[PDB]
Amino acid sequence: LRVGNRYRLGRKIGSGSFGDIYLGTDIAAGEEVAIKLECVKTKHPQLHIESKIYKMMQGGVGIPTIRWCGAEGDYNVMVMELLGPSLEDLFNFCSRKFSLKTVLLLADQMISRIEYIHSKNFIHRDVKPDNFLMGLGKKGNLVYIIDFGLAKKYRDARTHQHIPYRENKNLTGTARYASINTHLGIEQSRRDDLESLGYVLMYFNLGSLPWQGLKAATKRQKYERISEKKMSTPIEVLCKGYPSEFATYLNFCRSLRFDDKPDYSYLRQLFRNLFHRQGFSYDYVFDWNML
Numbered sequence: 001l002r003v004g005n006r007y008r009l010g011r012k013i014g015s016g017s018f019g020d021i022y023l024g025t026d027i028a029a030g031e032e033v034a035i036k037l038e039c040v041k042t043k044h045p046q047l048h049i050e051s052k053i054y055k056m057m058q059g060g061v062g063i064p065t066i067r068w069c070g071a072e073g074d075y076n077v078m079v080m081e082l083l084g085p086s087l088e089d090l091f092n093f094c095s096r097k098f099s100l101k102t103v104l105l106l107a108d109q110m111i112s113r114i115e116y117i118h119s120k121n122f123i124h125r126d127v128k129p130d131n132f133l134m135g136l137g138k139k140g141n142l143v144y145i146i147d148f149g150l151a152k153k154y155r156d157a158r159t160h161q162h163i164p165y166r167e168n169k170n171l172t173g174t175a176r177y178a179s180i181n182t183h184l185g186i187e188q189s190r191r192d193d194l195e196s197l198g199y200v201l202m203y204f205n206l207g208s209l210p211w212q213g214l215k216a217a218t219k220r221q222k223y224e225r226i227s228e229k230k231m232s233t234p235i236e237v238l239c240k241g242y243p244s245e246f247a248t249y250l251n252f253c254r255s256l257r258f259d260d261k262p263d264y265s266y267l268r269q270l271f272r273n274l275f276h277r278q279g280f281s282y283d284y285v286f287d288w289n290m291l
């Protein structure tokens with residue numbers, strides 16, 4: 001099928017937040033692309049909003065380039081450069097075990113991606129391994145951030161007025177990586193994207209989280225059980241046996257005030273100092289490169 005005169009639509013290759021992913025080719029450029037399709041008439045249309053966020057994010061390191069946006073037949077279409085597997089696919093491919101060097105190489109880039117989105121007045125709100133993809137070819141060392149479907153402006157683009165403190169909010173994101181504030185129903189802000197990343201890094205270290213795979217009757221009761229398990233698990237217990245930096249990272253995120261600008265530099269330097277004490281080289285040789 002033809003997409004915006006220039007793109008050739010192929011078979012389905014993946015599943016996305018509110019629209020499936022298809023293989024494509026930019027016929028004029030001779031380059032493969034990923035095409036996200038969303039039904040023109042749906043009770044919850046979100047592709048168009050997401051496109052605007054990606055467009056605002058353009059030029060940022062690890063921000064996927066959007067080649068085209070439009071409407072074709074029964075669908076709203078978004079065309080992105082082709083990327084590699086997500087950190088979840090790579091984690092499963094690596095038998096759910098990442099070396100400390102891989103976790104630290106990933107932590108460095110992931111903190112930067114989040115800082116970039118924040119510099120562009122947005123909070124991601126769904127920080128999880130599935131939303132970070134590795135690039136391909138010459139970009140194979142680069143971690144990309146995707147899925148702006150739950151992203152929200154946290155401050156006014158010009159005035160920098162932070163959004164007001166709100167309570168009794170709905171769990172926006174994934175329960176496994178949600179911050180304690182989110183479980184409490186507090187409006188998400190910059191600190192919450194970073195706390196989620198802290199749980200993602202501990203998840204890479206452990207293979208799973210202590211509140212993962214809890215037995216429950218309803219999805220709301222599962223969230224209550226996860227909340228309870230997260231609030232009953234001290235950071236030192238969660239991080240036992242791993243370098244103290246992971247715990248320091250999580251304690252710092254939990255200490256942040258609602259409208260505080262996080263010290264991203266300090267957080268990257270925490271892991272960089274550990275990376276150097278370990279004698280590792282920033283050579284971008286991840287565990288999967290040794291397979």
Ligand SMILES: CN1Cc2nccc(-c3cn(C)nc3-c3ccc(F)cc3)c2C1=O
Pocket residue numbers: 013014015016017021034035036078079080081082083084146147
């Ligand atoms: C298998 N692949 C490769 C590949 N490359 C690039 C992005 C994705 C991809 C994965 N998800 C969950 N969403 C997207 C996507 C997003 C916006 C778009 F405009 C197009 C695609 C994939 C993919 O699913």
